[PDB]
Amino acid sequence: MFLFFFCDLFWLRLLLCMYYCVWSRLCFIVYFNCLMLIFDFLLFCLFDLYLFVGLCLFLLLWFMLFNLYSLILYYCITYLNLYLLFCIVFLLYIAFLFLFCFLCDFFLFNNLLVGDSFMDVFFIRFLLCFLECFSLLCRCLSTFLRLFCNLLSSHFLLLMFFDFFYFIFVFFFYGVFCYWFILFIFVFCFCLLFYVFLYLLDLFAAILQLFIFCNMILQLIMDFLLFLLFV
Amino acid sequence: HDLPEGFEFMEHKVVNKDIHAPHENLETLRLTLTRQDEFLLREEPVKCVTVTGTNGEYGIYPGHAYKIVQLNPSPLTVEYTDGTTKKYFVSGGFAHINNEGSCDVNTVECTLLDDLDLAIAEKELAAQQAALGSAKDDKAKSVVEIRISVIEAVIAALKHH
Amino acid sequence: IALAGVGLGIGTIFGNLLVACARQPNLTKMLFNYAILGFALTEAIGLFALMLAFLMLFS
Amino acid sequence: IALAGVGLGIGTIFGNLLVACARQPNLTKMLFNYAILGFALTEAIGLFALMLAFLMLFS
Amino acid sequence: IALAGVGLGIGTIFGNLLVACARQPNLTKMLFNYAILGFALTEAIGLFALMLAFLMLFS
Amino acid sequence: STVAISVQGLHYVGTGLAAIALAGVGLGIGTIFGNLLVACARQPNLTKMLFNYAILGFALTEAIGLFALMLAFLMLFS
Amino acid sequence: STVAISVQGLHYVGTGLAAIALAGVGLGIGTIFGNLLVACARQPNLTKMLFNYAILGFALTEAIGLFALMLAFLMLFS
Amino acid sequence: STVAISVQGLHYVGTGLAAIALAGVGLGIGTIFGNLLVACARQPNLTKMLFNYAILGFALTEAIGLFALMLAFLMLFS
Amino acid sequence: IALAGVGLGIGTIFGNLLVACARQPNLTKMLFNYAILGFALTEAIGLFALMLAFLMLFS
Amino acid sequence: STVAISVQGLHYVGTGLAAIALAGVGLGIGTIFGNLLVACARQPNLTKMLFNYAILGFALTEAIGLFALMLAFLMLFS
Amino acid sequence: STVAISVQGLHYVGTGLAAIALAGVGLGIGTIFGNLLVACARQPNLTKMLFNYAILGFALTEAIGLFALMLAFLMLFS
Amino acid sequence: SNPADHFRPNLKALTLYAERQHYVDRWLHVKERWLAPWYLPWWSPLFQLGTWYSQRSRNLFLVENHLSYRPYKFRRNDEDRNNPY
Numbered sequence A: 001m002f003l004f005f006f007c008d009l010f011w012l013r014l015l016l017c018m019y020y021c022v023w024s025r026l027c028f029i030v031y032f033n034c035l036m037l038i039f040d041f042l043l044f045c046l047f048d049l050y051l052f053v054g055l056c057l058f059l060l061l062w063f064m065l066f067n068l069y070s071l072i073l074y075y076c077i078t079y080l081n082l083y084l085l086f087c088i089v090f091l092l093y094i095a096f097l098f099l100f101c102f103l104c105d106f107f108l109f110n111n112l113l114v115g116d117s118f119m120d121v122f123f124i125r126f127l128l129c130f131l132e133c134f135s136l137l138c139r140c141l142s143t144f145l146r147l148f149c150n151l152l153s154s155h156f157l158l159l160m161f162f163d164f165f166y167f168i169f170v171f172f173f174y175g176v177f178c179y180w181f182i183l184f185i186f187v188f189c190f191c192l193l194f195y196v197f198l199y200l201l202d203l204f205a206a207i208l209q210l211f212i213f214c215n216m217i218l219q220l221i222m223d224f225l226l227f228l229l230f231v
Numbered sequence B: 001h002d003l004p005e006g007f008e009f010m011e012h013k014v015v016n017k018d019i020h021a022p023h024e025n026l027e028t029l030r031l032t033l034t035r036q037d038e039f040l041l042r043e044e045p046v047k048c049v050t051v052t053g054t055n056g057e058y059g060i061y062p063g064h065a066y067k068i069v070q071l072n073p074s075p076l077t078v079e080y081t082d083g084t085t086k087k088y089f090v091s092g093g094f095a096h097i098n099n100e101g102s103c104d105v106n107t108v109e110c111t112l113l114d115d116l117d118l119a120i121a122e123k124e125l126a127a128q129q130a131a132l133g134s135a136k137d138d139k140a141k142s143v144v145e146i147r148i149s150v151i152e153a154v155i156a157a158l159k160h161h
Numbered sequence C, D, E, I: 001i002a003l004a005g006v007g008l009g010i011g012t013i014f015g016n017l018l019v020a021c022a023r024q025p026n027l028t029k030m031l032f033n034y035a036i037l038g039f040a041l042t043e044a045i046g047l048f049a050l051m052l053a054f055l056m057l058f059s
Numbered sequence F, G, H, J, K: 001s002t003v004a005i006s007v008q009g010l011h012y013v014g015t016g017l018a019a020i021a022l023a024g025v026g027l028g029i030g031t032i033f034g035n036l037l038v039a040c041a042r043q044p045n046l047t048k049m050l051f052n053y054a055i056l057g058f059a060l061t062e063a064i065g066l067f068a069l070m071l072a073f074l075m076l077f078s
Numbered sequence L: 001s002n003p004a005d006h007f008r009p010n011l012k013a014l015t016l017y018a019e020r021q022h023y024v025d026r027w028l029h030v031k032e033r034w035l036a037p038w039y040l041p042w043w044s045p046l047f048q049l050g051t052w053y054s055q056r057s058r059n060l061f062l063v064e065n066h067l068s069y070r071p072y073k074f075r076r077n078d079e080d081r082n083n084p085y
């Protein structure tokens, strides 16, 4: 089975071509922490710790072109599928993990064995290592699940509230001309307030979820970075 | 050429109780109430002492846990095992309470509540209140409000009894 | 299930008692009496819960 | 089950009573009265739940 | 069961009241009045739940 | 087989559950007033502004209680 | 045998359960204000920045309560 | 005898149960902001930094509530 | 389920015990004895719940 | 007589009950970040070190929710 | 009359109820790390020892979670 | 249901179907055509890359002796749990 379809970004692609045929400075980035990993001077890393910047920026652009514009009615999030997000996060996370593993430095994993020599090795430390190794994959899964669920829930709620607002506005506006106009006015004002609140909340939540999505990957990378001191 | 430290000439040091030691049942608190490097009371056994720190009022009895309290302008009560009461008024300072059964209350000024006059206290508040209205700047107003807080505490302290 | 609240409430009283006793050991006697008073009240509620249980289990 | 939120509430009052007594113990005779007042109100709530537990148990 | 929280909420008010009174005994009257205010507000919710219980009991 | 059943006593059960939410509201009221007293003792000068904010907190918490209470009454009479 | 049953009144039960989700929301809001009073009492000059953050916390907490309330009303009308 | 029964209305009950998970999430969020206010009054110089950490915690806590809300939609729409 | 409010109450007692021993490290014995007393009372409540559980289990 | 019955909508109930476990996880996370915010204001110089431990708790706290979430799928899809 | 009935779908309910036990484990872990952050700021010179004790506490709570999951899986399959 | 139907791609244009057997056979023909010429010895890494993994997978499939039944991958109806056929 081969389905031929298209993304919902063609107009946005046209706008990108129109408005970016000439250069422009960028000074505001959703996830700025990918550019500043080291905060104490004289510390440097031999690993390619700045390799994630390009992917981070592209992912932010793509997910912002989809999610932020999805607040416009009838705009489609073409990628909104659980397993597709799983594939994306699998790609990024496993690629970085295999980059660390191909280094063939086993000492890098010494920190997995949690605790000190005082703790019993078999009954405490080994179990903790098992849990942490499980927790890496669980972090991947939680990242993709969170990204999926936030969008799904937000858009379900928006659709339901908009349906209710349409119903009351269309089939009960005549109450403005009736003696119970005050009740309708109160309800309409409440609905407007709810509309504004929901839109603001969704706008903020989209950006914050993208921030967290990139921060999980950067945390994976940082957990295995080692910094040398200049002398 | 080594010089003595000024604390070597002081022969009344602070005794701390080792944490790994048995407890003792104490019925007396050794109080040391001090003003401007002058002790009004010295290792004086008192049944209880009531002090007003920033958080609130503390009633210190023998065996009270180790604590440091930053006092505020307020009355201080000292009750002897006789059941007799002596009330002072302090403008500030610190109170060090030791689990060994000692309380060293060092104040910048500690005056018996009898010495203070309520009539003088009331007129003084009125004067500072007028200045607070005409106080030039924010800093001046803050200083004036410090005086009012002390005055009202004094007025309230005397009206209590 | 009502015993869950009673058991927790009893533990809460003693938890504060230890803090209070450590703060001012000289008053352990008075605090201990008040702590027992609180237990005597919380356990009283437990009796009602048990009574209902025994008044429905044997019915 | 409502008794769980009553008995626990009683323990909370006494737990704070010990700390209040252990902070300034000369006010015990005053605090104890207020502590009893709180127990007199929460216990009153428990009666309402007890009332229903009895009305439905005998009807 | 709605009373469980109401009864517990009262205990919290009468728990902090003791601490507030011990810290600042000079303000017992004002604190006591506010405690009564909070108790009345919580009791209002308690009656709301009590109203529903009775209606569903005699209906 | 297709069987349709209408139980006329389950509009009571839902009503009782909606009343449970009141506990989370009633307890919330006590917490605000539980800490209001401490705040007044700490800073008696602000006995007024703190009281107003506490009233705001109580009203908003009560607003949640009444939203739940609306569901309780709707299912009681329907 | 294959038997299909459709119970009508169950939607009342589910709606009541969602109302319980407002218990924590109401409690959470009360907690914020209680902490607000202490912060104001311990730092009286910040009576506005703290107030703004309290409103922000209430808004987010209210949002969670509204997500549940949508299901409560939706099932009640299903 | 072997009898197979399929009750349609049960999906409402499971949906309502998931909504209860929001009670912890809503409460948890209020806990974060309560500490934020009590922390900004202890060290206002870091208010901007603390506000940033509070928001991060809100999303992580909020994320969990969405997991439950997804299950509600799955059963409510199936 | 009543055991849930028992185990938590026990944990509350010992949690406060550690703080009390930290605040007043020379009064460990009296705190330890009082903590044991609170555990015994709370455990007694749990035993009552266990009694009902076994009575219904074997009925 | 021997009668075997198969109720085909019960997995919804089990799924919702498992989802309720997420309330504790959400509450625990809020507690962690609340302590973090009130702890950074006390020792700001170590802010970064505290953050690392806070995330560790989240990693060890969110994992438990997955088990409950895992059971939901194993029953929702079966 | 003597009637014996065997419901297939009741193990889902038991599995869900057991999964609810994790809410306490998750909250307990949050409490452990919440205090850990506070303690580290108080006495940062003992970070390692406190971290070791916190891990021990997490392990014991996790062990209880394993017991609950063992019951859940047993009922789910058996 | 209806709200759930809003989360679908909105620009579906064409769907094509093809049997696994047919396109697998066509791919094998292409691979044979490109790997047949003499100037690509069998010992070259390219030829082994092309052939060895496929041979190994097919051998593993042939050697399989499972006690359970695996329903046909391309049945007409795979939605009924109580009918593997």
Ligand SMILES: CCCCCCCCCCCCCCCCCC(=O)OC[C@H](COP(=O)([O-])OCC(O)COP(=O)([O-])OC[C@@H](COC(=O)CCCCCCCCCCCCCCCCC)OC(=O)CCCCCCCCCCCCCCCCC)OC(=O)CCCCCCCCCCCCCCCCC
Pocket (backbone or CB within 6 Å): A002, A003, A004, A005, A006, A007, A013
């Ligand atoms: C049988 C019926 C026919 C169908 C046969 C199909 C055979 C299939 C074989 C089996 C395949 C199995 C696997 C399939 C998997 C599918 C998966 C999938 O779809 O995923 C979704 C996914 C959606 O991605 P997306 O995010 O939407 O972005 C992709 C877009 O293309 C946009 O992405 P982008 O913008 O980044 O792309 C770069 C873009 C950069 O931007 C541009 O260049 C702008 C233009 C964009 C064009 C492409 C968009 C198309 C929009 C819709 C169609 C436009 C109108 C067509 C009108 C048709 C009228 C009938 O540049 C181009 O597109 C380069 C091409 C430009 C062509 C310009 C031609 C100018 C001609 C001028 C002639 C003048 C003559 C003058 C003579 C004068 C004489 C006097 O699709 C893909 O990723 C691509 C899937 C393709 C898979 C390979 C298929 C095989 C090749 C088939 C070619 C058929 C040609 C013959 C057709 C004849 C008419 C009937």
Ligand SMILES: CCCCCCCCCCCCCCCCCC(=O)OC[C@H](COP(=O)([O-])OCC[N+](C)(C)C)OC(=O)CCCCCCCCCCCCCCCCC
Pocket (backbone or CB within 6 Å): A015, A016, A019, A068, A069, A071, A072, A073, A162, A166, A199, A203
């Ligand atoms: C950084 C923050 C950005 C915030 C932007 C805030 C925008 C504020 C907009 C105010 C209201 C605008 C009303 C528009 C009305 C249009 C006509 C109409 O009927 O619409 C009704 C529609 C729907 O209204 P409705 O739901 O009442 O429609 C009823 C229709 N029936 C009955 C048939 C169902 O309005 C909207 O959907 C508007 C929502 C806007 C939400 C904000 C979107 C922001 C993200 C997109 C930004 C795009 C920027 C691109 C720039 C270039 C990039 C390279």
